[PDB]
Design a protein around this ligand. Structure first.
Ligand code: MNR
Ligand SMILES: O=[N+]([O-])c1ccc(O)cc1
Length: 137
């Protein structure tokens, strides 16, 4: 289920984080509006860019903590407020997060691994709801 998937992801997290964020950027290329330094690069070139690897893994480090702290795929309100307030997230909207989680769910479905894709779909939805409640537009 969802808790086991957090452990699975954590066991190879730099790879999963980069592959999922690449699936997001390739499904929604306009999102690079918020990632101008990743423009004009293939997947293999991004995986050789230090901030791409370090920032993507740090994003997913925290994503796994928020998932682990959640109850039945519902994140803590303190985590949603942290994600709305962080300066790095200024001017993001909830649709940016919805799209990341569509790509994450599609990645899991395409995997041959028994990820609980429905629970990640729920978590993405519930995160978007918590972000909205905490003031993200
Ligand atoms: C499509 C837009 C974005 C979505 C969705 C998104 C979703 C999430 C998310 C999901 C639950 C979590 C957890 C998360 C967490 C972070 N996030 Mn976030 N994030 N996020 C940015 C856009 C987005 N984040 C940006 C832009 C930056 C700073 C610039 C750069 O780091 O590329 C940042 C930065 C960060 C950092 C700091 C990285 C560091 O400096 O190395 C963390 C941690
Ligand atoms: O996965 N993510 O949403 C990310 C990944 C890398 C980054 O620099 C910012 C956000």
């Amino acid at each position: 289920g969802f808790k086991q998937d957090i452990a699975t992801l954590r066991g190879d997290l730099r790879t999963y984080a980069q592959d999922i964020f690449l699936a997001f950027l390739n499904k929604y290329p306009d999102e690079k509006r918020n990632f101008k330094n990743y423009v004009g690069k293939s997947d293999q070139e991004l995986k050789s860019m230090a901030k791409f690897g370090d920032h993507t893994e740090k994003v997913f480090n925290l994503m796994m903590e928020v998932a682990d702290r959640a109850t039945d795929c519902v994140p803590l309100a303190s985590d949603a407020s942290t994600l709305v307030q962080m300066k790095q997230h200024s001017g993001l909207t909830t649709g940016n997060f919805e799209k990341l989680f569509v790509a994450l769910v599609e990645y899991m479905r395409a995997s041959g691994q028994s990820f609980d894709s429905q629970s990640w779909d729920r978590f993405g939805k519930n995160l978007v709801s918590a972000l909205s409640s905490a003031g993200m537009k």
